[PDB]
Structures are given as C-alpha cells and as structure tokens.
Amino acid sequence: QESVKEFLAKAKEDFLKKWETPSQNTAQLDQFDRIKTLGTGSFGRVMLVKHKESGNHYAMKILDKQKVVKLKQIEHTLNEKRILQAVNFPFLVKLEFSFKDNSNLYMVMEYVAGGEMFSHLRRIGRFSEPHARFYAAQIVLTFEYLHSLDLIYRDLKPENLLIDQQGYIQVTDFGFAKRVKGRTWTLCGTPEYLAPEIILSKGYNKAVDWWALGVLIYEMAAGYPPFFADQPIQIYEKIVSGKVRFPSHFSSDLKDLLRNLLQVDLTKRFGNLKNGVNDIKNHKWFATTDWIAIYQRKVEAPFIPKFKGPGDTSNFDDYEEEEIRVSINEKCGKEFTEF
Amino acid sequence: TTYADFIASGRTGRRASIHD
Ligand SMILES: Nc1ncnc2c1ncn2[C@@H]1O[C@H](COP(=O)(O)OP(=O)(O)OP(=O)(O)O)[C@@H](O)[C@H]1O
Ligand SMILES: [Mg+2]
Ligand SMILES: [Mg+2]
Numbered sequence: 001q002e003s004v005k006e007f008l009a010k011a012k013e014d015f016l017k018k019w020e021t022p023s024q025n026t027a028q029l030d031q032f033d034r035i036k037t038l039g040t041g042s043f044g045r046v047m048l049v050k051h052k053e054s055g056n057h058y059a060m061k062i063l064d065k066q067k068v069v070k071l072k073q074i075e076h077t078l079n080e081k082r083i084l085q086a087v088n089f090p091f092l093v094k095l096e097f098s099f100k101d102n103s104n105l106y107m108v109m110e111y112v113a114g115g116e117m118f119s120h121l122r123r124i125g126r127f128s129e130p131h132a133r134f135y136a137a138q139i140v141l142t143f144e145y146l147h148s149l150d151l152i153y154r155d156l157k158p159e160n161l162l163i164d165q166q167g168y169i170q171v172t173d174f175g176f177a178k179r180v181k182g183r184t185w186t187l188c189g190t191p192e193y194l195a196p197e198i199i200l201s202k203g204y205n206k207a208v209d210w211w212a213l214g215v216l217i218y219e220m221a222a223g224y225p226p227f228f229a230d231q232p233i234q235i236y237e238k239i240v241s242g243k244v245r246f247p248s249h250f251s252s253d254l255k256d257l258l259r260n261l262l263q264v265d266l267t268k269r270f271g272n273l274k275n276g277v278n279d280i281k282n283h284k285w286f287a288t289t290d291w292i293a294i295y296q297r298k299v300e301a302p303f304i305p306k307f308k309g310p311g312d313t314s315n316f317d318d319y320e321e322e323e324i325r326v327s328i329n330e331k332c333g334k335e336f337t338e339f
Numbered sequence: 340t341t342y343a344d345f346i347a348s349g350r351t352g353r354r355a356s357i358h359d
Contacts (some may be wrong), residue, residue: 042355068353073358118353125342175356188358192350224345232357247341 001278008148011088015149018086019179020036024339027108028098029326032060035311037319043067043077043103045322048111048313057311058096059112062324063105073175074335076188078172080191081107081339087207089145090297091138093162093170100339103327112170114163114305117220121158126223129254131302133286135161136217137294138169140286143213144277147206150181156212157190158219163315167301191232196264199236210271210280214261222247222252226262240264253285 033050039046039311044062068077084095084107097108114120118137121127123188127135146153154176162170176188183203193215195238218226226245227238242264246255257280263269270279281291293299305315345351 071358076358116353122351155356158355173356176358184353186358188356190354192354209350223342228348228350230349245341 008145011145012149014088015086015188016107019082021099022082022336022338023085025099027099027106029101029106032058032108034060035326036313037321038313038316039194040319042071043073045221048311049108050311057111058108061107061109061112063107063112065100065103065105065336069332069335073180076175076178077105078338079178080176081105083151083179084109084178087146087149087151089142090295091142091169091171093172095301098339101326102330105294105336105339109118109172110170112164112172113307113310113312113315114161114165114167115165116159117161117169118158119315119317120163120303120305121220121223121324127220129221129251129285130288132217132220134294134299134302135169135220136213137286137289138276141211141217141291141295142169142278143206143271146177147209147277149179149181151177152184152206153209153212154178154186155189155193156209156216157193158216159190163305164301165304165307166297167304168297191235192219192227194236194239196240196242197266199240205272207266207269207272209220210261210269211263211270214258217261218246218258221250225275226258251285253283253287257283258284276278 006246030053033046033052034049036048037045038048038059044064046059046061046315049058049060062196063077068074081098085098093112095107096111099106109242155173160185163174164170183205185203187198195204195211197204198208215226244262260270266272271277274281
C-alpha cells in the first residue's frame with residue numbers, strides 16, 4: 001500500500017478544514033416537501049422529503065431541541081452534525097444541508113432507498129459468508145477512514161447500515177460519533193454491540209468499534225447476534241463472560257477472525273494492535289477481498305434492492321405520522337448556537 | 340436451536356440505542 005496513506009493524508013486535510021469551520025444554515029424548512037416518515041427516534045423523526053427546486057429526494061432528520069436537552073444529548077448532537085458536515089467517504093451517508101428553527105434541529109441527508117440492512121437480514125434469515133464479507137469489507141474501510149481522523153463511531157449495527165441502489169452500504173446515525181484522541185468514558189451504543197470495556201465502565205478507545213465489527217459479521221453470517229437475551233443486563237453478562245459460540249456452518253477462517261475481533265483483552269484484539277487495520281485486511285477470511293475494488297465500488301454487489309421510483313419507501317417500515325409544529329418562541333438558543 | 344431461541348426472544352426487532 002502507498003496510495004492509501006496518501007489518500008488518508010489528503011482526507012485528513014479536507015476533514016480538518018471543515019472541522020475547523022463547520023457549515024451552518026444551508027437550507028430552511030419551507031424548501032422541502034415533507035412526505036413520509038422513514039424512521040422514528042428519541043429526538044424526533046427521520047422523514048423522506050423532496051427538495052422543491054432540485055426535485056431530489058432526501059432524508060430529513062428532525063430533532064426536537066427540548067428533547068435533546070432533556071436527554072442531555074446536547075454535546076453528542078453537536079458532535080454528530082459537526083462530524084457529518086466535515087467527513088466524506090463512499091460508504092458514509094452524506095449531509096447535504098443542516099439548519100434549525102425555533103423548536104427543532106434539522107439534518108438533511110441523501111436518501112438511501114434500499115432500507116436498513118436489518119430489514120433484509122431479518123427477512124432473508126442470514127447472509128452466506130461471501131455476502132457478509134462484501135459488507136464487512138466496506139465497514140473495515142470506513143473505520144480505517146474514520147479512526148484516521150480520530151473519530152470514534154460507537155453505534156455500528158444493521159439498523160444503522162443502509163443499502164444503496166448499487167447494493168453498497170451507507171453508514172448512518174452519527175449520534176454517538178466523537179472526535180477524540182485518547183480515552184473516553186461515555187456509556188453509549190446498542191446492548192448486543194457493546195464492547196466489554198464499555199459495559200465495565202473502564203474507559204475505552206476506538207477498539208470498541210472493531211469489537212462491534214465482530215458482532216456485526218457474526219450477526220450477518222449466523223442470522224442472530226453472538227450475545228442475545230430478553231434483557232440488556234443478561235446481554236452484558238454474556239458479553240463480559242467472554243464466551244462465544246459459533247454456528248456449525250461457520251468456516252474455520254470466519255471463526256478465527258471473530259475470536260480475534262471478539263477478544264476481551266485489548267492487547268489481543270484485532271484492529272487495536274501494532275499493525276492496526278492491516279491485521280484484519282490480511283486475514284485469510286478476507287483473502288478473497290480486493291480492498292481497492294471495494295472502495296471504488298467496482299465489485300458486483302450480491303444483492304440489489306428492488307427499485308421502483310425515486311421517492312419509493314417500500315424498503316422501509318411504516319410509522320405513525322405526527323404533527324410538526326414550530327414554536328413562536330426560540331427554544332434552547334444558547335445550547336445549539338453552533339449548530 | 341439457537342435460531343429458534345432467538346426468533347422467540349424479545350429482541351428480534353429494531354434495537355434502540357442506549358445512553359446513561
Ligand atoms: N439517509 C437516510 N436515508 C434513508 N433512511 C434513513 C436515512 N437516515 C436515516 N434513515 C432512517 O431513519 C432511521 C433512524 O435513523 P437514525 O438512526 O439516524 O435515527 P435515530 O432515531 O437517531 O436512531 P437511534 O435510536 O440509533 O439514535 C434509520 O434506520 C433509517 O430507517
Ligand atoms: Mg440509529
Ligand atoms: Mg441515533
């Protein structure tokens with residue numbers, strides 16, 4: 001590799017310039033036709049919208065400022081926008097516009113019609129190893145990119161991996177993303193995907209993302225996660241147990257990669273070692289993988305979602321559809337001044 | 340089977356993020 005560190009060097013410059021001086025107020029609410037809710041959440045919803053002058057469809061994420069403040073997610077939200085407007089990568093969902101009004105924060109992202117990986121994974125049951133390795137490869141390249149910018153992602157899961165029309169992954173939800181050099185201590189993520197050091201409140205680094213990758217690869221190939229139960233606590237117990245069992249149909253390579261990733265000891269976890277990401281890229285499981293054709297998206301995807309129109313939502317579950325009011329008074333002005 | 344035990348569990352749906 002030579003044009004890799006060259007790539008990441010130029011990418012750090014592009015990122016840091018946007019990081020230093022983030023864009024703001026690049027649209028407003030009346031420029032969009034609100035059509036349908038693609039996904040719900042704690043802070044508000046994620047609607048499918050059409051840009052009035054462009055005709056393009058986007059996914060507008062709406063955040064109730066008061067709910068953000070109430071859940072003490074102010075800083076996390078400021079992280080998410082600032083990181084999103086600054087990063088740029090083939091497998092990352094792209095932030096077109098950001099703005100705010102008296103009541104809400106808005107993040108307008110390119111629309112990914114293929115739906116969550118979650119939905120296709122659950123319906124199909126499980127992916128064969130070649131299918132799971134096409135996806136895993138995209139995540140490997142994405143974490144390499146992000147970590148080089150000192151960004152930690154902290155919420156990898158099939159629910160946050162969208163599939164585009166060419167069958168590739170777009171990573172979404174940067175709510176827990178954070179630029180950090182060194183350790184951090186926030187308990188956040190999704191139970192089945194929490195690294196042991198997160199649960200044990202030890203303080204952790206970007207190695208929790210590689211653990212999450214192991215969990216992802218396992219779920220994609222097994223059809224279920226390596227640690228599941230009915231209550232998160234019992235999930236944490238299995239995670240900190242350090243004991244994992246693989247399905248009989250798992251290849252010997254796949255098993256070896258996963259024990260390396262689901263390694264409880266940070267001194268023996270893949271991605272957290274001297275050779276960093278290349279320990280993973282040069283694993284036998286990935287011996288078939290052309291990292292360059294993956295990035296360039298020249299491979300052929302093993303699955304391409306049924307397309308049937310620009311504003312189609314057939315790959316998304318239906319949600320109840322709430323009012324959208326804007327208070328006549330400004331809410332939480334000081335807190336979100338930099339958004 | 341593990342699959343059967345999973346499909347019968349309460350966390351087969353979309354899983355919420357957590358923070359505290
Ligand atoms: N760019 C997008 N294109 C299409 N759909 C999207 C897009 N972004 C988000 N969605 C839909 O919204 C859902 C929720 O998005 P997201 O995770 O960002 O919201 P959230 O409510 O913050 O989730 P979480 O509970 O993880 O915090 C996604 O699963 C997807 O269904
Ligand atoms: Mg999410
Ligand atoms: Mg989120």
